[model samples]
Target: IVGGTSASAGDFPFIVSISRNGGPWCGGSLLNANTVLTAAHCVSGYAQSGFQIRAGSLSRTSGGITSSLSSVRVHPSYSGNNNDLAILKLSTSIPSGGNIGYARLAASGSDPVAGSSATVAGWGATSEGGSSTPVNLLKVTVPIVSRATCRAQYGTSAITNQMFCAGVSSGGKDSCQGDSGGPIVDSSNTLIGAVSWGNGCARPNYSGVYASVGALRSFIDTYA
Candidate 1:
């Protein structure tokens, strides 16, 4: 199963919600007991104070939910190129329960070799311009691809040593918009990457890209 023994229905979880300009949108991850990581672009236009972190419980509609965002820290050189990882410190802690547990990190120096398979999970958009699903965690299998081939297909603007690509060549299966910052788990069910972007949901030749957990060891160590 996934990491953490307590990670069942209505368990430990964190999410991002964008509530600005008359509507609420966006998503993020609760990476630690008190820290949340998400995509920077999700909060770029906000007053920096309008964004919030939803933690505790897995159910979007009926679960123990708390909102506490004290500080936000975007990677010093983050620019969406590397999917722009950012951390948010909570103002308080969430109580542990049967449905709540923290996710484990990837083994140090671990990278998914090409042809390797992994899973990406999140509560993001189920379809283009679709309403976000609060309950029911979504997951998909993606095959790791080589950097050379990924760049050749998607261009080299956003990918770097800190990133990697995975999914189908015909685009039948993959993550799309709104799935950013979600975990891409390895065979051992360990989080090896974070969903970043893709040409489209499960589109051919355009696989989903993620932040390489292997390349971001220092970042994980600093906060995790």
Candidate 2:
């Protein structure tokens, strides 16, 4: 759940825990009854045989619907961190009632301006380099930073058009390990990004990096 506090059930119904070999490893969002949006890095080296998606619950291990992965589609340009996005096709459609719902992707050319408030939720570690994965979903509110400011902070080579940054200036809250592939949504609840990487968990000068959903809207539409 990153550095955020615990989230109540139904707070972010679209959020899902990506389990590998029956263990939660990353966060994902339900894009539809049969599609999940996540980070490519989470599934890059993994096979479809051991992956599953758990939805409809705040708890990672119980009271949710689970579906096996039928297929995976990682962005072709994914290299280390660039274009780090993936879509998972579920073996069956998840029931839509109760805590299960789908998130709407931000429209093409629609970008959230810097300084706008956004929310990110997951079941990742609360601290950097920590091995703990929270049982309950965690969430944090962060402000988006301008591309110029983000690039200056991470260097020109690190920040790209395919990514964006969000966090506090003093950095008390942000996404950390195991939060990868989780949704980052704007005030309207439209998915603007997906957790990709970060220097650390809520460091003073470091912000969490996310795969730009707006920039990859077409790619997502093609397969989602």
Candidate 3:
């Protein structure tokens, strides 16, 4: 949940827990019956046989459907940090119903404007230096900050066209450690970003950076 509150069961059916070595390490979003959207770093250099996807659960450890990843598609330009996006193709389709569903990607040429409200959800740590990941999914409301404003805080080199920022100036409400690869959605539930990087979890003047989903629509469609 990062800095947010516990989410009700089934409230966010599209949320996915990415498991490695039989444990949750990152978050993802179910984009369709067989596609999962996540950050490139989440799966980078990892063997496809070691990854699993758990969907339709509020608890990170229980009551969700699990599937093996058939393939992982990372952007060609993806380095360790930039272009940090990836698509996971499931070995089998997850029937969409009950507690299971999918999220829509932001339309091409569309993005949430600065000052607009957005939500980020995950099972990440509640605070910096924390050791344990939350059992239940957590979510927080954050405001989209303009690139100019974000650059001022993060420096010009850290901010890029493939990224966008969201969070408050003071702090205490942002995605932290273990929340990487999670979804950042707008008011309409359209996925606009994926949790990427940050200086620290919810630190003052340090906004959370996300991989710009809007800018990667064509790439996603080609492989998702």
Candidate 4:
């Protein structure tokens, strides 16, 4: 949430907190009443029963409908930050309400291109070294970077079609550390990406990398 502002209850209905051990550690987006999309890095190597999704919450610590994950699916090709997407199957349904909604996945290959703007929201730490997440959610508007240029920034082996980059080159505003698994959506409110990784938070020329929903839509649809 570097250089971002706090979000109110009604701001990001589809975005939810991914909790570990009864604490919110990551963020996720609701695809339906039961399916949630997040970053593989958040749930990989973790037990399914230890995680849950808290919807309709502005605060990470409390106030939401908590749904347990019946199962989780991390991309088969997931390695490092390459295919950093994950799908969660909820054991309980999170009904649609004024404070919660499901995100529409971006159609395959229809992801926003460079120069396009998107909104990223999360309850992750507000500072690079912050020990705790914000009580209120936070959001920032960032510009998209094409894979071609983003690939060059992080070197050829870094960026992939399954991933995209967002933020300014000078970097005053961007997703900070602990914001992993949060949703990044296009202007259309279409879920386009999920927090993956970056060189560092809000650092110059080091835009935050994200798991591209457009590239992973088919795989996500399998669970949707």
- What lDDT tens digits, residue by residue, belong to model 3 across residues 88-166? 9999889889998888899876766999999999988998868888888999999999999999997997888889999
By descending lDDT, how would the candidates be arranged?
Answer: 3, 2, 4, 1
Give the TM-score comparing model 1 with the true structure, all chains together. Answer: 0.81
Question: Mind sharing the TM-score for model 3?
Answer: 0.97
Each model's TM-score, in the order given?
0.81, 0.97, 0.97, 0.96
Output the better candidate (3/4) by lDDT.
Answer: 3
Q: Residue 151: error of model 3 in Å?
A: 0.7
Q: How close is candidate 4 to the true structure, as a TM-score?
A: 0.96
User: Each candidate: how many clashes?
Assistant: 10, 2, 1, 0
What RMSD does each model have against the real structure? 4.4, 1.1, 1.0, 1.1
Q: Model 1: runs farther than 4 Å from truth?
A: 1-24, 129-135, 156-158
Q: Kindly list the per-residue Cα lDDT of model 1 for residues 129-223, writing each as its tens digit.
A: 55554354556677898888898988876568778888778766666565676667778766677677667677678777888777776776686
Q: Stretches of candidate 2 above 4 Å error?
A: none
Q: Across residues 84-192, which tens digit of lDDT does each residue of candidate 2 receive?
A: 9999999978977887889988987776789999999998888777867788899999999887888888899998888999998898889988889989999998999
Any runs in candidate 3 off by more than 4 Å, and if so which? none
lDDT of 1 at 216: 74
Q: lDDT score of model 1?
A: 0.63
List residue ranges in candidate 4 displaced over 4 A.
none
* lDDT score, candidate 4, position 52: 74
